[PDB]
Amino acid sequence: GHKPLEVIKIEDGVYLHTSFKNIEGYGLVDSNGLVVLDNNQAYIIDTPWSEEDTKLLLSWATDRGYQVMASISTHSHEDRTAGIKLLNSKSIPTYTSELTKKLLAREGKPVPTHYFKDDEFTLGNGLIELYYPGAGHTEDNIVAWLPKSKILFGGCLVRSHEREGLGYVGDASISSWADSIKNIVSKKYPIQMVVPGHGKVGSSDILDHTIDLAESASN
Amino acid sequence: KPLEVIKIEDGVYLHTSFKNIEGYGLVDSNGLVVLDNNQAYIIDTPWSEEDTKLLLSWATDRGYQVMASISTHSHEDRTAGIKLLNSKSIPTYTSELTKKLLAREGKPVPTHYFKDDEFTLGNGLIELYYPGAGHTEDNIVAWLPKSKILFGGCLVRSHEREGLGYVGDASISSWADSIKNIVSKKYPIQMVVPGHGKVGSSDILDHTIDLAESASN
Ligand SMILES: [Mg+2]
Ligand SMILES: [Zn+2]
Ligand SMILES: [Zn+2]
Ligand SMILES: [Zn+2]
């Protein structure tokens, strides 16, 4: 029994959704995704951490008259993909990279109904730019760039300022992590904000901070 | 990663369980196996029925007879293995309050329970005490007169740490007073074992009170 999904506007047409989980002995932990609006059309970047909170996110959208067009999950882990089954059941198109899809299939988890094969892909016909920069937090982590709001959703490939560790490295490729962040920087996005998969939103600085953590863990 | 087990004194084993929480990291959870000859008593079951079966096999591979388990409160953290020990017909113990709390949530209940604020297990091997609400409304602590160890469970917080943990079921304004009741026993404490984290001295005790006299502020 935890507190419910929270949804708040961080830019024009961009909402941060945050779900929560009780971690006994530690306390309450947060997990972020985004909803991106294109007129009356809504696109979900990473599902909430549970099916129950995914239901609340869909209710949030439909109560405002929005049409949920698609979701994209930025890697295969539960906190990115928990809602995929529910969205599939409502015939809402679900997306991941090809690798992410096949990773889910191997662990016998529900898979998206759609997937992209190349290092770049777009959702909402240019609204959301997706990019695979290399392995880091996981083999398959991708990032999402929003040209209009100039928001980079880094997911778990990036660490908030409040953290001085990489977090869960069980599926990680630490010696590749720093290079993967560098690849994002090389894209030369005019980043105004970076949204992490956990913790507070920040600036371009998050990338440098993440590179420091990666290079420390590998040394 | 799989269950771990560690000698921390003659006749006292620390068992630590782990499980992957996707989206944050790996968590640990502590309990004890206390021995009287070949008779073993478990303080808090591991976090899973799997790890509990592993903990049982650890005991029976060494010829130990598992006499009973005690759970320090009703959270799955501490009672996950009750139904297994029940199925294996091994006596399971909690406070009466913890038992009633488990029945209401429709979760497995222990076969045994004590009704007072004090209760002794083994033949003096383990002294149980209910100091009042803190982590939960029902949390109890276990004192080991021989090893002079106090198992604090989640009613206590290691340092190497902060943040009283999950306080959803907590009585934060009651916490500090509950901890002081444990000091009232004047147990010749030389060691404290928290439900999570590292093993410490009688300092872990005073530390936990600072956090309660701070969250209630
Ligand atoms: Mg991928
Ligand atoms: Zn992850
Ligand atoms: Zn995550
Ligand atoms: Zn608890």
Side-chain angles (χ1 to χ4, degrees), chain A residues 1-23 25 27-40 42-84 86-116 118-163 165-199 201-219, chain B residues 1-6 8-18 22-37 39-46 48-82 84-159 161-217:
Chain A
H2 56 276
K3 56 152 145 173
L5 187 80
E6 300 186 355
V7 185
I8 95 105
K9 188 181 165 196
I10 57 168
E11 252 291 356
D12 185 48
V14 187
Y15 298 76
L16 183 81
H17 67 75
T18 307
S19 31
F20 303 88
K21 218 152 184 171
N22 309 348
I23 297 199
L28 216 57
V29 294
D30 62 311
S31 182
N32 305 315
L34 297 177
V35 185
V36 187
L37 304 187
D38 208 344
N39 294 317
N40 201 84
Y43 296 80
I44 300 173
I45 301 175
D46 284 333
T47 71
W49 212 341
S50 75
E51 180 167 299
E52 297 77 8
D53 289 312
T54 300
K55 168 62 192 302
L56 289 174
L57 185 59
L58 291 172
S59 297
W60 176 95
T62 54
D63 282 349
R64 288 158 175 75
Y66 301 151
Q67 183 182 5
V68 183
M69 304 303 295
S71 69
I72 175 60
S73 295
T74 57
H75 64 279
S76 75
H77 283 172
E78 191 73 4
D79 59 297
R80 310 293 115 199
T81 55
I84 289 181
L86 183 65
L87 296 198
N88 285 343
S89 78
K90 295 227 180 174
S91 307
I92 296 169
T94 52
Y95 291 77
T96 70
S97 70
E98 182 179 21
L99 175 56
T100 298
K101 174 270 177 210
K102 286 194 168 64
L103 288 182
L104 288 164
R106 174 151 273 109
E107 269 295 321
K109 292 164 63 175
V111 303
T113 57
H114 304 83
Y115 68 94
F116 67 91
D118 297 319
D119 285 345
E120 281 88 15
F121 181 76
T122 196
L123 253 199
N125 301 291
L127 186 74
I128 309 173
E129 297 184 8
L130 303 156
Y131 174 53
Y132 175 75
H137 167 77
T138 53
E139 309 153 74
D140 62 317
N141 47 217
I142 61 173
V143 296
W145 166 249
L146 309 178
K148 184 171 178 287
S149 58
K150 300 184 178 176
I151 292 172
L152 179 74
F153 184 88
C156 297
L157 182 55
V158 309
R159 307 292 287 166
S160 59
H161 288 123
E162 308 87 63
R163 296 190 216 308
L166 295 168
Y168 182 77
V169 288
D171 294 318
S173 162
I174 301 180
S175 57
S176 322
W177 199 319
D179 289 318
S180 298
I181 303 303
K182 178 55 166 281
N183 288 336
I184 299 170
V185 175
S186 292
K187 219 74 173 183
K188 291 175 78 81
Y189 296 129
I191 303 174
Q192 178 183 338
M193 307 164 49
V194 180
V195 180
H198 313 281
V201 176
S203 62
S204 264
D205 190 35
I206 270 76
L207 306 189
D208 309 277
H209 178 55
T210 299
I211 289 169
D212 290 336
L213 297 175
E215 291 176 338
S216 181
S218 49
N219 292 329
Chain B
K1 49 159 140 171
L3 184 72
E4 280 183 26
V5 66
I6 290 172
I8 58 173
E9 190 166 5
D10 284 313
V12 187
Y13 294 69
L14 178 83
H15 71 77
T16 304
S17 44
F18 302 82
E22 299 286 11
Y24 134 90
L26 56 101
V27 280
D28 69 87
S29 181
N30 291 336
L32 303 171
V33 184
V34 190
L35 294 174
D36 188 315
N37 294 324
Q39 298 189 347
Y41 296 75
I42 295 168
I43 302 178
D44 284 337
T45 69
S48 79
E49 183 165 281
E50 290 82 77
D51 284 326
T52 306
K53 175 58 169 80
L54 293 172
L55 185 61
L56 289 175
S57 301
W58 176 90
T60 57
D61 281 346
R62 297 163 174 72
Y64 297 148
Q65 182 179 1
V66 178
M67 307 300 286
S69 70
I70 59 173
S71 307
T72 58
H73 61 281
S74 54
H75 286 168
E76 181 180 2
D77 188 18
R78 315 247 143 286
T79 62
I82 288 185
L84 178 63
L85 271 74
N86 283 345
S87 59
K88 294 210 187 281
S89 179
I90 295 175
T92 55
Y93 283 79
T94 68
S95 65
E96 193 185 24
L97 173 55
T98 298
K99 187 218 185 188
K100 291 290 191 187
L101 267 39
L102 280 165
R104 182 156 301 146
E105 247 64 9
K107 287 309 188 181
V109 290
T111 58
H112 296 71
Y113 49 92
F114 64 99
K115 297 195 183 190
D116 236 271
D117 287 340
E118 255 276 17
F119 175 71
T120 176
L121 254 179
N123 238 69
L125 195 72
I126 308 169
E127 293 190 1
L128 310 183
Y129 178 59
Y130 171 67
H135 172 66
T136 55
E137 62 198 88
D138 63 331
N139 43 225
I140 61 167
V141 296
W143 167 248
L144 308 180
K146 162 168 153 69
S147 348
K148 296 218 203 169
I149 298 172
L150 179 82
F151 186 85
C154 295
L155 184 57
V156 301
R157 315 290 290 142
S158 181
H159 192 46
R161 200 132 313 187
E162 197 180 347
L164 296 179
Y166 168 59
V167 300
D169 295 327
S171 303
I172 299 159
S173 72
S174 298
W175 206 312
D177 299 320
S178 297
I179 302 299
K180 297 227 198 176
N181 274 13
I182 295 171
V183 173
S184 311
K185 257 55 188 170
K186 273 146 186 157
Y187 294 146
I189 301 142
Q190 273 143 209
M191 198 146 114
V192 170
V193 183
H196 313 260
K198 191 166 180 180
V199 241
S201 66
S202 54
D203 164 88
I204 309 297
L205 188 8
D206 305 89
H207 175 217
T208 301
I209 283 166
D210 294 333
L211 283 297
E213 293 178 354
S214 290
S216 172
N217 296 74

